[PDB]
Design a protein around this nucleic acid. Structure first.
Length: 890
DNA sequence: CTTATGACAGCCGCG
DNA sequence: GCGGCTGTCATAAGA
C-alpha cells in the first residue's frame, strides 16, 4: 500500500509524525526537517520560483526550522516580504506526500470515549477534577471493542460489578437493553480503586494510542477531566503520557462572558463529535446535547434512568455503566449514519492538513492553494497582518408586509464563489480603480460602463481579464472536481442498480463488459453490487467535501488571517452580489410587466442574499384561476412558465450585466426553487411576509420535487424559535397552516378554541425557554439590578424561593431555562419565575407555581401577540369584528 | 461572522 | 404612564 500520515507535530527542531508504513503498520518517526522559504531577488538571478505576482524569488534552505522562524522575524524587522509556507508541519506534509493520498481507514485508530464522574456538589469542573473518575468506556476502531473501566470503590460508594448478562436483558426484565450488536464486543474491567483504573487506562492508552480521538463533548470535558485528574494525582509527568510525544499545551479559550479549558495532546487529532456535527450536518438544532441529537438521528436517544445522575451510581450502578456504554455507542451510531469522521479524513488528506484543521477553512484553503502553487514552482505570499474592518455584506429587500397568494422563488447558485470566478477576483489580479457611481445607477444601467479593458465589480475595482487568478482557478478546480466525483456518483449509484434489479464502475462501462455479465451468481452479481455501492460511497464523500470547500471559501477570503485576504476584493464580491440580485429584480420586473401587459408592477416581492421571491398572481390571472382542473394544474403551469419563459429572460438579463461589468465569464445562473400558493378553490392565502427574514409559504414544488401533501416553508417566525413554548409552537404552526391553506374563518375557530382550552394545557408545554447568560452580572445579592433581562429576574426569583434545598436543581450559567410569568400579589415576590429546562419544577414550589402563574399574560405574551404579527401582515383577523381603524398609526 | 427581528429595560418628554 | 426610541439580549438563517 501507498504510505500515508496519521498525525504531525513540530516540537523544537523536529517533526514528529505518526504514519502508516508501506506494509500497513503504525509507526512513528522524528525528522529534522529542513524547510525552504523565499525572498525576492534581482531579475538578474535565475530561479524556477516566482511569486503569484510573477516576481522572481530565491529559495532559501535552512539547517532547521528555528533558523526559518528567526529569519522571518529578522526579515520582518528589516521590512521585506518573507514568502513561502511559514507553517512547517504543512510544508513537511507537502514534501513527504507529493502524491494524491490514498488512505486505508482500517489502519487508523479512531478512539471513541466517554467518562463518568460522580459529583454530589454540581458540575465537575474539568480544570479542577475534584472528584474521582468512576467509569470510562473507550471504543477502539481497530480491535472494534468497547473497553469498559468500572470503579468499584469511591468516596460515593462501593458497588457490585456490572453484569453483561443483566445488561442484555429487556427493560421490563430488569435489564439495560444493551444492543446485541455490541454485547460480544464489550470488554469489562472492574477496579478496586481510582489509581488502579487510571494507570490501567493510561497503560491501555500507550498500547492503543488514538490517532483520531472523538466522542461527544470530549474536547471540553472528557479530555481535560482525565488529564487533570491524572495530573493532580500522579503528577503532570504521568498525565503527559497521554500524548505519544509527551507534550501537552494547556489552553484557556475566552467566550461571550467567560472562558474554557482545552488540552492539546501532541501527536493526537481531537475531533470532538459535538463539533463534527455542528460543522458538517448543517441543521440548526435547538439543543446540541446527545439525548436530542441521538433522538433526532436514530429515534432512540440515551438510556433512561430514575433520579439525579449524581445519585445514579449508588442507586443503580448497573444502569450507570450501561448508560455509559450506550452513550459511546450512540455516538458511533450517528457516525455510522453520517460518516463525519471519514468525511474528515478525506478532507484532511485531500488538503494534506492535520485532520483537526478541517474545522478551519483558512487552514484548509491555505494548504490546498499552497500545494497547488508549489506544483507549478510558485511561491505563496507572506501572511500580512490586517486591521479588522467591517465591509458591506448581503443585500436584503424590505418586503411590503402582506399576504401573497402565489409565489415562486429563484436562487443564484454558489453566488459568492461564482462571483469570484466571474469577475476574476484574486490578490494578484487587481488591475486598478474606476470612479464609482451610486450602486443604484449600476443597478439601472444608467451608470457609465466602468471599463472595456478590465473585469469589474461595482465597488470600484478592476481585474485583469486575460490572466488566470490563483483564487478563481483553485475554486474552479474544486467545482470541476465536484462535477467529476458527482459523475462517478451518478454512475455507480445509477448504472449500479442494473446489476441489482437483474438478480430479482466510475463510468458505465461499454456494452461488452455489461454484456459478458448476465450469469446469476452468489459469488458475483450480489457480491459485486457490494462494490458498486461501495464505489458510490466514495463518490458522495468526495462530492460533499468539494461542496464544503466551495461554500467555505468566502469565509476564508473575508478573514484578515487568510494569506489571500484583501478588503477591496471581499467588498468586490459582496458589492457585486448586491448589484446582481437587484439588477435581476429589475430584469424580472421588466420582463413580467411586458409579458403581463402591466407597467411598473412590483413582481419581485422579496429578495435575500442570493435569491428572489416573485409574485405569480397576475400570471395566474392571465389564464384565470378557473381553467385549472386541480391544484396540480397551476403548479404545472407556473413551473413550465418558469423553465420556459422566465429563465431565458433571467439568463438574457445576467448576460447583459456580465457585458456591462465586462466580466471574464458569465456564471450567474438561477435555479427555480419553491412554488407556493393556496389549495385550489379554497380560502387560503398561500403565503405572507411580515418583514425581512420573516415569512411563511405554502409550498407544492421545491425545484423539481412535487410534494404529495403541501408543506409549510416558514422562516423567521415564532414557530421556528426554540424560545417558544412547545404547545404554542404547535398552535402557531396550525394557525399558519390554517391561514395559508384554509383561510380566515378556519383560523378564527382555531384561535377561539385554543384560547378556550389554554388553561388545560401542560405547564411545561406552555412555558417559554431561554438561555441563562450573565447570571452574576445582574445578581445584586439575589435580587435583579439595573437593566436585568426578564428571564434572569425569573431565575433570581427561583433562587430566593429555593435557597435552602439541595434536592432542588440549581440554575447554572449557560443552561437553558423554562420561564413563566406570575400574577401580581404572588408569594415569590416578583413578576416572573424560571427553572431548569427539560425538567419538572421541584415539588417544593411546583404546586404553588401552577397556582400563581399568569395565564392571561402568558397567552398574550407568547401566542396572541406574535399571532397579531402574522394576521396584521396578512390582512386577516384572528377573531370577529376587529375595528379596521387599528390598522392606522394615528 | 452578516443580515435580520423581536422581548424587554430604561431613558426622555409629555400640564 | 406611554410612545418613541436606543441599547442589551436572545435567536434565525445561511454562510
Amino acid at each position: 500500500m501507498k504510505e500515508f500520515y496519521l498525525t504531525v507535530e513540530q516540537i523544537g527542531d523536529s517533526i514528529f509524525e505518526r504514519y502508516i508504513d508501506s506494509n500497513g503498520r503504525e509507526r512513528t518517526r522524528e525528522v529534522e526537517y529542513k524547510p525552504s522559504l523565499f525572498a525576492h531577488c534581482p531579475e538578474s538571478q535565475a530561479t524556477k520560483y516566482f511569486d503569484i505576482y510573477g516576481k522572481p524569488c530565491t529559495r532559501k534552505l535552512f539547517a532547521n526550522m528555528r533558523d526559518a522562524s528567526q529569519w522571518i522575524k529578522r526579515m520582518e524587522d528589516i521590512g521585506l516580504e518573507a514568502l513561502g509556507m511559514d507553517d512547517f508541519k504543512l510544508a513537511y506534509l507537502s514534501d513527504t506526500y507529493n502524491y494524491e493520498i490514498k488512505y486505508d481507514h482500517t489502519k487508523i485508530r479512531v478512539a471513541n470515549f466517554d467518562i463518568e464522574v460522580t459529583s454530589p456538589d454540581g458540575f465537575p469542573e474539568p480544570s479542577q477534577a475534584k472528584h474521582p473518575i468512576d467509569a470510562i468506556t473507550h471504543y477502539d476502531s481497530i480491535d472494534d471493542r468497547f473497553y469498559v473501566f468500572d470503579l468499584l470503590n469511591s468516596p460515593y460508594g462501593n458497588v457490585e460489578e456490572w453484569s453483561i448478562e443483566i445488561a442484555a436483558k429487556l427493560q421490563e426484565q430488569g435489564g439495560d437493553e444493551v444492543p446485541s450488536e455490541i454485547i460480544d464486543k464489550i470488554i469489562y474491567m472492574p477496579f478496586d480503586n481510582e489509581k488502579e483504573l487510571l494507570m490501567e487506562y493510561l497503560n491501555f492508552w500507550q498500547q492503543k494510542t488514538p490517532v483520531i480521538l472523538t466522542g461527544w463533548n470530549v474536547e471540553s470535558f472528557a479530555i481535560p477531566y482525565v488529564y487533570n485528574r491524572i495530573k493532580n494525582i500522579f503528577g503532570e509527568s504521568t498525565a503527559k503520557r497521554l500524548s505519544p510525544h509527551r507534550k501537552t499545551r494547556v489552553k484557556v479559550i475566552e467566550n461571550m462572558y467567560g472562558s474554557r479549558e482545552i488540552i492539546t495532546l501532541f501527536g493526537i487529532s481531537v475531533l470532538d463529535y459535538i463539533d463534527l456535527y455542528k460543522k458538517f450536518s448543517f441543521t440548526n438544532q435547538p439543543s446540541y446535547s446527545l439525548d436530542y441529537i441521538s433522538e433526532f438521528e436514530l429515534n432512540v436517544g440515551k438510556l433512561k434512568y430514575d433520579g439525579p445522575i449524581s445519585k445514579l451510581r449508588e442507586s443503580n450502578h448497573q444502569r450507570y455503566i450501561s448508560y455509559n456504554i450506550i452513550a459511546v455507542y450512540r455516538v458511533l451510531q450517528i457516525d455510522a449514519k453520517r460518516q463525519f469522521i471519514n468525511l474528515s479524513l478525506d478532507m484532511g488528506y485531500y488538503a494534506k492538513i492535520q485532520i483537526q484543521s478541517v474545522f478551519s477553512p483558512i487552514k484548509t484553503w491555505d494548504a490546498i492553494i499552497f500545494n497547488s502553487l508549489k506544483e507549478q514552482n510558485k511561491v505563496i505570499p507572506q501572511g500580512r497582518s490586517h486591521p479588522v474592518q467591517p465591509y458591506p455584506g448581503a443585500f436584503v429587500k424590505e418586503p411590503i408586509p402582506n399576504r401573497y397568494k402565489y409565489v415562486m422563488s429563484f436562487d443564484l447558485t454558489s453566488l459568492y464563489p461564482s462571483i469570484i470566478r466571474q469577475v476574476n477576483i484574486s490578490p494578484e489580479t487587481i488591475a486598478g480603480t474606476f470612479k464609482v457611481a451610486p450602486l443604484h445607477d449600476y443597478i439601472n444601467a444608467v451608470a457609465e460602463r466602468p471599463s472595456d479593458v478590465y473585469s469589474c465589480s461595482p465597488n470600484g475595482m478592476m481585474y485583469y481579464k486575460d490572466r488566470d487568478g490563483v483564487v478563481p482557478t483553485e475554486i474552479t478546480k474544486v467545482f470541476n472536481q465536484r462535477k467529476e466525483h458527482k459523475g462517478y456518483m451518478l454512475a455507480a449509484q445509477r448504472n449500479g442498480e442494473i446489476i441489482k434489479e437483474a438478480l430479482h464502475y466510475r463510468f458505465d462501462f461499454s456494452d461488452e463488459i455489461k454484456e459478458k455479465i448476465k450469469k446469476l451468481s452468489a459469488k458475483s452479481l450480489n457480491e459485486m453490487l457490494f462494490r458498486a455501492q461501495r464505489t458510490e460511497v466514495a463518490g458522495m464523500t468526495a462530492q460533499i467535501n468539494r461542496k464544503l470547500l466551495i461554500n467555505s471559501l468566502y469565509g476564508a477570503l473575508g478573514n484578515v488571517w487568510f494569506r489571500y485576504y484583501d478588503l477591496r476584493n471581499a467588498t468586490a464580491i459582496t458589492t457585486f452580489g448586491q448589484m446582481a440580485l437587484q439588477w435581476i429584480e429589475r430584469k424580472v420586473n421588466e420582463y413580467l410587466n411586458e409579458v403581463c401587459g402591466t407597467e411598473g408592477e412590483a413582481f419581485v416581492l422579496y429578495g435575500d442574499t442570493d435569491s428572489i421571491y416573485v409574485s405569480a398572481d397576475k400570471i395566474i390571472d392571465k389564464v384565470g384561476e378557473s381553467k385549472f382542473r386541480d391544484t396540480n394544474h397551476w403548479v404545472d403551469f407556473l413551473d413550465k412558465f418558469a423553465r420556459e419563459r422566465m429563465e431565458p429572460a433571467i439568463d438574457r438579463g445576467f448576460r447583459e450585466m456580465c457585458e456591462y461589468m465586462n466580466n471574464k465569464q458569465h456564471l450567474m445562473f438561477m435555479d427555480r426553487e419553491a412554488i407556493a400558493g393556496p389549495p385550489l378553490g379554497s380560502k387560503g392565502i398561500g403565503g405572507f411576509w411580515t418583514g425581512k427574514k420573516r415569512y411563511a409559504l405554502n409550498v407544492w414544488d421545491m425545484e423539481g420535487t412535487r410534494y404529495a401533501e403541501p408543506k409549510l416553508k416558514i422562516m423567521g417566525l415564532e414557530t421556528q424559535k426554540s424560545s417558544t413554548p412547545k404547545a404554542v409552537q404547535k398552535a402557531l404552526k396550525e394557525c399558519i397552516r390554517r391561514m395559508l391553506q384554509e383561510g380566515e374563518e378556519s383560523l378564527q375557530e382555531y384561535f377561539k378554541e385554543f384560547e378556550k382550552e389554554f388553561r388545560q394545557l401542560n405547564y411545561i408545554s406552555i412555558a417559554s425557554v431561554s438561555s441563562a447568560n450573565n447570571i452574576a452580572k445582574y445578581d445584586v445579592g439575589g435580587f435583579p439590578g439595573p437593566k436585568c433581562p426578564f428571564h434572569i429576574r425569573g431565575i433570581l426569583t427561583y433562587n430566593r424561593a429555593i435557597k435552602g434545598n439541595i434536592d432542588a436543581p440549581q440554575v447554572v450559567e449557560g443552561e437553558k431555562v423554562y420561564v413563566l410569568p406570575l400574577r401580581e400579589g404572588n408569594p415569590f415576590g416578583d413578576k416572573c419565575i424560571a427553572w431548569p429546562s427539560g425538567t419538572e419544577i421541584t415539588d417544593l414550589i411546583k404546586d404553588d407555581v401552577l397556582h400563581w402563574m399568569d395565564y392571561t399574560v402568558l397567552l398574550e405574551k407568547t401566542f396572541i401577540k406574535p399571532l397579531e404579527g402574522f394576521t396584521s401582515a396578512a390582512k386577516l383577523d384572528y377573531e370577529k369584528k376587529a375595528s379596521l381603524f387599528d390598522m392606522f398609526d394615528f
